[PDB]
């Protein structure tokens, strides 16, 4: 069925609450045990949000290996990202461990420093060219090289040197910074803009690691973002574009990291950027 015809048929029907439900209910449930070790309670952002162990990340070290961060692979699409939690005061030295690591161009950041009057996730990166930044229990150093501020997202060149062996590589960090403290965008036009810029960067490309996407639980704004991303590549791939089912997307997406889309207003908003998104990807 078309998305546009089903999104219609939903909105006059008033069940957006009821189909959200039908997915949350479907969705996977995989073991996450190494997230509830003793040992990581302080890497964890939230009690209820947590890695499957088939899918997470691991550091690269013997002491500790956890990360809050999932990896999202899509066969079809050809496409992978990396799902993570806003970094806390304690993580940010194993943040920028996992970007060196998995060799990644860009990270995508959904959300700001302090919402609703409380924080968020940590200051990770350097406001000024000047005070550079040094993660000691890493041994990396974080340079910021340009910041472009426009109306709906900022875009940041960053640094990043490995001090055990002094190699360097440019990091894109990408920076959405309008989504509303409350819901969700009226229109998804700046949405759709600043994924875009991402995609015109390299920063998704198979050429590069895995990008890093992170809101503060890195599973609503963040699985908004590449349940999107994902499905206008489909619709670009394949003979039949209406073809493509978003639900069946969302809980495959869902079979590597719990809880991706938080609300039936995300949802409903992941539809609406694919429709209008769709009016790109068949020419004009």
């Not at 089903?6 to 909105?11: A, G, H, R």
Request: net charge negative.
């Amino acid at each position: 069925m078309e998305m546009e015809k089903e999104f219609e048929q939903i909105d006059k029907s008033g069940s957006w609450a009821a189909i959200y439900q039908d997915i949350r209910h479907e969705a996977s449930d995989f073991p996450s045990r190494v997230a509830k070790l003793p040992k990581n309670k302080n890497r964890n952002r939230y009690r209820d949000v947590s890695p499957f162990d088939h899918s997470r990340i691991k550091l690269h070290q013997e002491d500790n290996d956890y990360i809050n961060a999932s990896l999202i692979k899509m066969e079809e699409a050809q496409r992978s990202y990396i799902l993570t939690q806003g970094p806390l005061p304690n993580t940010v030295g194993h943040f920028w461990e996992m970007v060196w690591e998995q060799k990644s161009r860009g990270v995508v950041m959904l959300n700001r420093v302090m919402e609703k009057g409380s924080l968020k996730c940590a200051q990770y990166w350097p406001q000024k060219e000047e005070k550079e930044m040094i993660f000691e229990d890493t041994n990396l150093k974080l340079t910021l090289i340009s910041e472009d501020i426009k109306s709906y997202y900022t875009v940041r060149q960053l640094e990043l040197e490995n001090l055990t062996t002094q190699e360097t590589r440019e990091i894109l960090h990408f920076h959405y910074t309008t989504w509303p403290d409350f819901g969700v965008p009226e229109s998804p036009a700046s949405f759709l803009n600043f994924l875009f810029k991402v995609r015109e960067s390299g920063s998704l490309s198979p050429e590069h690691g895995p990008v890093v996407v992170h809101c503060s639980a890195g599973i609503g704004r963040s699985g908004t973002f590449c349940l999107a991303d994902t499905c206008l590549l489909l619709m670009d791939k394949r003979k039949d574009p209406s073809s493509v089912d978003i639900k069946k997307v969302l809980l495959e997406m869902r079979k590597f990291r719990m809880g991706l889309i938080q609300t039936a207003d995300q949802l409903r908003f992941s539809y609406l950027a694919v429709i209008e998104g769709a009016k790109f990807i068949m020419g004009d």
